[PDB]
Write a protein that binds this ligand. Structure first.
Ligand SMILES: CCCCCCCCCCCCCC(=O)SCCNC(=O)CCNC(=O)[C@H](O)C(C)(C)COP(=O)(O)OP(=O)(O)OC[C@H]1O[C@@H](n2cnc3c(N)ncnc32)[C@H](O)[C@@H]1OP(=O)(O)O
Ligand SMILES: Cc1nn(C)c(C)c1N(C)S(=O)(=O)c1c(Cl)cc(CCCN2CCN3CCC[C@@H]3C2)cc1Cl
Ligand SMILES: [Mg+2]
Length: 382
């Protein structure tokens, strides 16, 4: 595919060999003050997610027009409260919640977001942004609106003095820094087979499959408990030290650790291991993101838990993730999803995860560096 838009952007070309490390173009010392022109009848609007009505409008846009599987059976159902968690971390800016509205009706038909993040990439730490929730309403598709959204968020980020970004997508664009693969652990195999997320091996029965994926009723690790306020510093310490081994990671402040890990029901779960000495030595975490199930008579929503950050120093990772599955099961999740990044390959096959179809490509904007294997990627975006 010849990339009409992406060929114009400061990113390496697909199949460019990259032996260097650094920006593609210099920081811009003058920035376009005027928003990019949209097609006639549409206008920019910064979305105040503190206005419940506006948040609801965004919820609806994404609920109806965001990412679907290739067979149009599932669509992500990001909740309003989840969207607040994902889009208002420390340093969030209202101008980086970038909406497109119809002029006449004010209907929300487009969105893109940036949130700030300090990013470690090989031997460099840079203040960057993370781009997510790029969404164009189905009736506006293939009219070149996404490039305008990308240029406009780029402009708004440039105005704040930031010249690099990190982002992920299911599609191949110039040029991935790394490629990960989704893996899936059945928790409720009957429902997953009923809704055609999984399929029964012609070998096996339903009772056999349920027996195969059965988990204990309680976790095995000594002194596992939910994260509490007093754990914020040590969770930060554990995460900071653990992430140094990977080549692409966030560098979180203690306030960011609080934001991303402190438990919020139906959004983010974090459990810490406090040993017999009273020291916190490990933690596991996973976020809540259901998918709407289209066209099934009895089942309307697929409850999925997503592996977030799991830090081990004294508990074996295999055991940590076993307890993660048990906890997810207890809370009523149908499936536990995880990528093959960080050290996840050490446990996926052993804990009966099955490999999915979807790839997640990782990208940097305006940063040229060698690509890395999935096991060196240490960043998880919602
Ligand atoms: C320094 C600061 C920098 C900040 C910015 C950093 C970069 C941020 C980049 C964004 C990070 C997003 C992170 C996420 O949120 S990934 C999730 C993306 N969202 C969805 O998949 C939801 C469902 N799909 C849609 O809403 C639309 O189909 C979208 C909006 C995806 C495309 O709209 P539409 O279908 O109406 O297409 P068009 O005619 O307007 O535009 C076609 C052009 O756009 C290129 N395209 C297609 N898909 C993607 C994609 N996922 N990332 C980047 N580019 C993409 C495509 O190759 C083509 O360019 P080229 O092939 O001609 O070159
Ligand atoms: C049950 C279900 N519901 N939906 C909606 C889907 C697709 C399924 N599957 C069938 S799946 O196997 O679970 C699966 C698959 Cl095929 C592909 C992907 C690629 C995710 C794309 N990115 C773009 C970037 N964004 C920022 C970080 C992630 C986010 C989304 C994810 C999954 Cl989760
Ligand atoms: Mg379009």
């Amino acid at each position: 595919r010849s990339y009409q838009f992406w060929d114009t952007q400061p990113v390496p070309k697909l199949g460019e060999v990259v032996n260097t490390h650094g920006p593609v173009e210099p920081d811009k010392d003058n920035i376009r003050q005027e928003p990019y022109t949209l097609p006639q009848g549409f206008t920019w609007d910064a979305l105040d997610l503190g206005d419940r009505g506006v948040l609801k409008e965004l919820y609806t846009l994404l609920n109806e027009n965001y990412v679907e599987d290739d067979d149009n059976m599932f669509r992500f159902d990001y909740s309003p409260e989840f969207l607040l968690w994902a889009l208002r971390p420390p340093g969030w800016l209202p101008q980086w919640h970038c909406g497109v509205r119809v002029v006449s009706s004010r209907k929300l038909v487009g969105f893109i977001s940036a949130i700030p993040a300090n990013i470690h990439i090989y031997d460099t730490e840079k203040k960057m942004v993370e781009i997510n929730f790029l969404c164009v309403h189905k009736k506006l598709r293939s009219k070149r609106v996404a490039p305008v959204l990308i240029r406009e968020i780029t402009r708004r980020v440039h105005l704040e003095g930031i010249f690099q970004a990190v982002y992920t997508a299911g599609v191949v664009l110039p040029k991935p820094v790394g490629t990960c693969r989704y893996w899936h652990r059945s928790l409720n195999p009957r429902k997953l087979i009923e809704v055609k997320f999984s399929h029964l091996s012609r070998n096996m029965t339903m009772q056999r499959t349920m027996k195969l994926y059965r988990l204990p009723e309680t976790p095995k690790t000594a002194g596992l408990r939910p994260m509490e306020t007093k754990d914020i510093p040590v969770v930060h310490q554990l995460l900071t030290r653990y992430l140094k081994q990977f080549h692409l990671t966030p560098v979180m402040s203690q306030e960011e650790v609080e934001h991303w890990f402190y438990p919020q029901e139906n959004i983010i779960d974090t459990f810490v291991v406090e040993n017999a000495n009273g020291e916190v030595t490990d933690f596991l975490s996973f976020y809540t993101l259901p998918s709407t199930i289209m066209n099934h008579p009895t089942h309307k929503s697929l409850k999925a838990a997503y592996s977030f950050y799991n830090v081990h120093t004294q508990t074996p990772l295999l055991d940590l993730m076993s307890d993660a599955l048990v906890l997810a099961k207890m809370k009523g999740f149908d499936v536990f999803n995880a990528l093959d990044l960080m050290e996840n390959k050490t446990f996926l096959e052993k804990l009966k995860f099955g490999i999915g179809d979807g790839n997640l490509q990782y990208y940097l904007y305006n940063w040229k560096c060698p690509s890395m294997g999935a096991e060196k990627v240490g960043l998880v975006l919602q």
